[PDB]
Design a protein around this nucleic acid. Structure first.
Ligand SMILES: [Mg+2]
Ligand SMILES: [Mg+2]
Ligand SMILES: [Zn+2]
Length: 155
DNA sequence: ACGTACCTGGCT
DNA sequence: TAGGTACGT
């Protein structure tokens, strides 16, 4: 049951950007503070990486917990048009996996930064984020993800 | 003003 | 591909 009326829910949905979202803005700011001259929204790479760091041959995705189905407190299965959302979100999850595989096949190290780690009552501190980012980017560690519990290598 | 909880279409 | 709105602070 939606907390908005049709018109309002439509307005809310129309306001959602496809780049330069809240989580992308905070990550950009963190990377800029670190002195990294990164690129963004690379339509030439699989999944159009949110961020690209050529200098360390790595890319970074900022995942919205709803859109990418993170199994965290931010995600709830829609109670309206459930079938539609389950298929759409399910397809997003499958595409996310494929994108990561392709990038790796191209020689790119991938880092996933979940939204809950960037905003919300469980978000990591600026210091904690900056440290984990700098260590992962500048290091040679394989693909990983950052959630509220810190950083972890991808399966 | 601001942080969080509650919710789940639009635009290329 | 979050972010509008209601609420408590
Ligand atoms: Mg993107
Ligand atoms: Mg993203
Ligand atoms: Zn999450």
């Amino acid at each position: 049951a939606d907390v908005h009326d049709k018109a309002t829910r439509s307005k809310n949905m129309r306001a959602i950007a496809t780049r330069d979202t809240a989580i992308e803005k905070r990550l950009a700011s963190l990377l800029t503070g670190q002195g990294l001259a990164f690129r963004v929204q690379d339509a030439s790479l699989p999944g159009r990486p949110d961020f690209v760091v050529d200098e360390y041959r790595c890319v970074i995705f900022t995942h919205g917990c709803f859109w990418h189905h993170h199994h965290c407190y931010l995600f709830k299965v829609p109670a309206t048009r459930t079938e539609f959302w389950l298929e759409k979100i399910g397809k997003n999850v499958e595409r996310d996996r494929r994108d990561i595989s392709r990038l790796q096949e191209l020689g790119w190290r991938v880092l996933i930064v979940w939204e809950c780690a960037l905003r919300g009552r469980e978000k990591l501190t600026d210091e904690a984020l900056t440290e984990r980012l700098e260590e992962w980017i500048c290091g040679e560690g394989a693909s990983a993800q950052i959630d509220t519990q810190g950083i972890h290598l991808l399966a």
